[PDB]
């Protein structure tokens, strides 16, 4: 398919990996009596291995000649869920964290002792801020366009050139 | 192969280069 890789649900080396993992757990299972808690734990591990390999084989993942899933991250929509959509989820959460931290820093600057606000958090105000972060791209962009995000170069300290 | 005389000729050329190198080192040392 892409880059000469084959889908994992028809790659024989993917099946060989699954068979080897199941056999490695089953030879451990052989030394325990049926009904013992180690036997149930090992059978649950076998079930989880089988379910994981089935799910990976039915997901459209591509496997190389090693027998393991290979991710495609060039932007194509047939593999957008391998990097692009996890990337969007991360970017949402990270922009949330950055926005609420910046908002708390700017609030703490207004306090009587800002450093005390840094080491002893005002928990209700911080919880208000972490609630505000769900609309962080629009809020941050409006903060940017109103001149409230970027400060001019003549108001930042710099070393002698 | 290489003879004794050829090695001696190379040694003489290397000695000439040694004298020239000593002169350059003295010139650079002012």
């Amino acid at each position: 398919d892409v880059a000469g890789l084959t889908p994992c649900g028809e790659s024989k080396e993917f099946a060989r990996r699954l068979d080897g993992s199941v056999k490695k757990l089953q030879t451990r299972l052989k030394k325990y009596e049926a009904g013992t808690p180690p036997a149930l734990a090992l059978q649950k591990q076998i079930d989880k291995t089988k379910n994981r390999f089935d799910r990976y084989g039915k997901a459209g993942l591509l496997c190389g000649t090693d027998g393991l899933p290979h991710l495609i991250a060039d932007g194509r929509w047939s593999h957008s869920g391998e990097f692009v959509i996890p990337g969007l989820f991360f970017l949402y959460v990270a922009g949330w964290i950055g926005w609420v931290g910046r908002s708390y820093v700017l609030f703490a600057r207004t306090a009587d002792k800002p450093t005390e606000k840094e080491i002893i958090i005002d928990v209700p105000v911080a919880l208000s801020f972490v609630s505000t972060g769900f609309i962080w791209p629009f809020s941050a962009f409006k903060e940017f366009t109103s001149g409230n995000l970027i400060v001019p170069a003549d108001e930042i300290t710099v070393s002698p050139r | 192969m290489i003879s004794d005389t050829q090695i001696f000729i190379a040694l003489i050329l290397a000695l000439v280069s040694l004298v020239l190198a000593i002169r350059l080192g003295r010139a650079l040392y002012q």
Binding site: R52, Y56, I119 | -
Partner: protein, 42 residues
Amino acid sequence: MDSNFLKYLSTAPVLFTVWLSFTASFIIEANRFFPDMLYFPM
């Protein structure tokens, strides 16, 4: 509840430990109920 004890509970190391444990517990329970998520299913 004593306000001084609440103020101690609001200190940076305590809140840091509680928040990171809370986050870790989210990741652990998500991976317990939805394991082996190498990809976003689409």
